[PDB]
Structures are given as C-alpha cells and as structure tokens.
C-alpha cells in the first residue's frame, strides 16, 4: 500500500539505437548496501 | 511484428541467459548485483538484443517490465549508491561506479551515451541530485542528472515491486514502485 | 519458474537477435538458409540460451514452436538436401554438410552430439534413409538415422506451416506439417 | 494436407540443461533454396 509513481514523455527513438540490451546495474562507494533482484518479467512488441 | 518475452521468477546458480558484468552474480535464488561491501559495481543484462524501434518504418515498440528487488543496508542512515533498470547499446560495458551507478560518466548531456535509465538512488550526491537531499526515483537520459525525479522513502531490507511501461503512441514512460 | 518466448512475423535485413552461421542471412523479409546453389549450409539460432531441464530439481520444460518455410527447387525430381529445426549445446557450430543436414556426423549414435533435430528430408541417402526412397519427416537424436519417420509429398515452392510441441509430463514430441 | 508424427523422446537423457534452438539446411550435389517466412517460440520450466 505505499506507492511512488513517475511519468515522463521520453521519445526513445531519438536517444537509443534500434537494437538495445536491457538490464540492471547497482554500485556502492564509501557507503554500501546489498542490491539484489528476486524476479524479472519483460515483454516488448514492435509492429 | 517482433516480440521478445521472458520471465525468471527464481534465479539459479547457472543462469546462462544473463550476461554478468563487474561483480554481479546469482546466489541463493537471487540475482545479487552488489553484496553489502564498499567500492563495487555489478550489472546483469538479458542475453538477446531487443528491437526497440525501426528505421525503415519509423515504428517504436511498446514494452513492459516488472521486478522485485531488495536493498539491505547496515542501517537506514548509511546507504549508497543505488540501482538502475537501463536500456543501452548492444555492446554496453560498465561505466563510472559510485554515484554514477555504473551507467553514466557525467552530469553533462552526452548524446554518445545512448542510454536511458530509471534509477533508484539512495545517496545524495550534491553536484546533481535534488537539493532537498531525499532518496528518489529518477529518469535519466544520457546523463546522471535526472530529467525528472520523485522522492521515495527507502524501507531497508523490504522487497519492493516495480513496473516500468512505455507506450509508443504517446511516448510516455511510467514507473511505479510499491511496498506491501 | 522460467519462460522464454519470441515471434518474428517478417525478417528484417539486420536481425540482431539471431546468430547466423554458414551462408544463412535475411533478405526480402525472409530468413534464407540456402540459396539454390550446390554444396552450401546455412543455420540460424535464437541468441538466448534456453533452459530445457534443471539437474537440481529434475524438472523438464514444455515448448511449442511454429514456423512457415518454403523449399524452392528447379523441379520436383532434382532436389536436395532438406531442412532441420534442432536443439543442440549452446556452443553448436555447423557439422557435416550434404545429407547430414549440417547437424550430425554419423548414422552411428554419438552420445557426445547432444542434439535432437526434426528433419524435413528431400533426398534419399541409401546408407541410412527409409528404403522406399520417399521424402519424409523424421525425429533424429544423436544420429542422422531417424528413430522414426513419416513419408511426405513435397510441394515445390509452396509454403508449409509447421508446429513442433514437447510435453515434459509424457515426454512426447509431436510434429505437424500442413500445406494450406 | 497434413502430416503428423509423435514419439516419446526423454530429452533430459540427450541434451544439456541449457541449449540453443535454430534451423539448418544444406545442399549437396543436388539443391533447392530453403527459406523461413515466420517463427514463434515459447518454452516454460517449472521451479
Ligand atoms: Ca546519488
Ligand atoms: Ca537424406
Ligand atoms: Mn539521482
Ligand atoms: Mn532422413
């Protein structure tokens, strides 16, 4: 029940190549935490 | 028409359809990008390239991804740096660590980056982060300084549910994070 | 749980989610495995590895694939060699050409092959094919000698729709070809 | 006009845990063009 939503217009064709890879990254520096993913689902459709 | 779909509800120790970079690896049914250790970068990419837009017809794809993730820190005060879902060239490699989240190199706009990312930032870097010092969700296109951000209160060690959707008709990207 | 799915309705010139080997490539929005030239091999693989079974749990996957293909020969009598859908190790590379279909190296069972193929064979090779000389659909596991065969009347230049489905609970592999 | 074949094939006894799927075709002393016009794949593994 606690939610955070963000919406933005982002013309992807202007910024990214036609073929891409997708994924996750995380970092620590002088402070830290464990960053872990438990599950992942993805669906894309190009007409 | 082209579609690409996959789901991994439980990660296993030999997860061959993922590309691991830096110190990311799978363990304990989990994909771990980072252990709670200083100075690390970890990334994982899905193995197939995906076709996001086409220059012959000018069409761009609709997509939706969801994932659940955990950030587990020593305490609620000393937490850094954050986590990203990102979209980048096929040959993408880790970039600057720490505050740059392994995906960008500068706060200056660089069209050469060709990366858009949704970040979940836990440490306030004063040169580019929102001036109120809050942890936040942000949309980044070719720069670590977000084009828009929403404040988020971290619940340490709790799992969060995220949905990111892109609608090609309106070019709008929507990010939703939920804690139970 | 793990699932992988994709569809390609029309192939483009730069189809980056496929691995091409031999002289296979995309043209005129089709995937071309061989052109009607002597002594060639072409293969195309999906770029992501698929998790077919897991040794930790002993679970095996179900899958379904459907495709439309065309064999275009000079005439109905002078035609060779045929076509395969196959399942092989992640590092698979083309094997013997000609009647071996680019997937096997003997009619003798070679357990180091680790590949099962569904062939649509248009040329009779006496050493291992059904003696009645017909063109046929067969299931091959570690050898070019099919463990089972069904006779098929090739319709030169006509498109054929096939469905191949595997069900892990009964371990049955089903093949259907239809000319509409 | 349809042709159907069915067979029991214990896949766990023949292929690795991870595989790549694809198509191959060849010619020898005789020949033909072999082309694929569309392709759909789906796999599911319980765990
Ligand atoms: Ca930061
Ligand atoms: Ca043959
Ligand atoms: Mn930020
Ligand atoms: Mn045969």
UniProtKB/Swiss-Prot annotation, chain A:
Keywords: Lectin, Mannose-binding. One of its GO terms (molecular function) is D-mannose binding. SUPFAM superfamilies: Concanavalin A-like lectins/glucanases. The keyword Hydrolase does not apply. Pfam families: Lectin_legB (PF00139). Tetramer of two alpha and two beta chains. Belongs to the leguminous lectin family. This is Mannose/glucose-specific lectin alpha 1 chain. It comes from Lathyrus ochrus (Cyprus-vetch). The lineage of its organism: Eukaryota, Viridiplantae, Streptophyta, Embryophyta, Tracheophyta.
From Swiss-Prot, chains B, C:
Keywords: Calcium, Lectin, Manganese, Mannose-binding, Metal-binding. Gene3D superfamilies: 2.60.120.200. PROSITE patterns: LECTIN_LEGUME_BETA. One of its GO terms (molecular function) is D-mannose binding. The keyword Calcium applies. InterPro entries: ConA-like_dom_sf, Lectin_legB_Mn/Ca_BS, Legume_lectin_dom, Leguminous_Lectin. The keyword Cell wall biogenesis/degradation does not apply. Ca(2+) binds at residues 121, 123, 125, 129. Mn(2+) binds at residues 119, 121, 129, 136. PANTHER family: CONCANAVALIN A-LIKE LECTIN FAMILY PROTEIN, LECTIN. Tetramer of two alpha and two beta chains. Belongs to the leguminous lectin family. Binds one manganese (or another transition metal) ion and one calcium ion. The metal ions are essential for the saccharide-binding and cell-agglutinating activities. This is Lectin beta-1 and beta-2 chains.
């Amino acid at each position: 029940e606690t939610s955070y939503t963000l919406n933005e217009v982002v013309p992807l064709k202007e910024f990214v190549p036609e073929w891409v890879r997708i994924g996750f990254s995380a970092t620590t520096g002088a402070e830290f935490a464990a960053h872990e993913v438990l599950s992942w689902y993805f669906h894309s459709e190009l007409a | 028409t082209e579609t690409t779909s996959f789901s991994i509800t439980k990660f296993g120790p030999d997860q061959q359809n993922l590309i691991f970079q830096g110190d990311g690896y799978t363990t304990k049914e989990r994909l771990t990008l980072t252990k709670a250790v200083r100075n690390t970068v970890g990334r994982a990419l899905y193995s197939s390239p995906i076709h996001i837009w086409d220059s012959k017809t000018g069409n761009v794809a609709n997509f939706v991804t969801s994932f659940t993730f955990v950030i587990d820190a020593p305490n609620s005060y000393n937490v850094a740096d954050g986590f990203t879902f990102f979209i980048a060239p096929v040959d993408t490699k880790p970039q600057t660590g720490g505050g740059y989240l392994g995906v960008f190199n500068s706060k200056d706009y660089d069209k050469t980056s060709q990366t858009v990312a949704v970040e979940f930032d836990t440490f306030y870097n004063t040169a580019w982060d929102p001036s109120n010092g809050d942890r936040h969700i942000g949309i980044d296109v070719n720069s670590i300084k977000s084009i828009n951000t929403k404040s988020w209160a971290l619940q340490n060690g709790k799992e969060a549910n995220v949905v990111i959707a892109f609608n090609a008709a309106t070019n709008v990207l929507t990010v939703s994070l939920t804690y139970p």
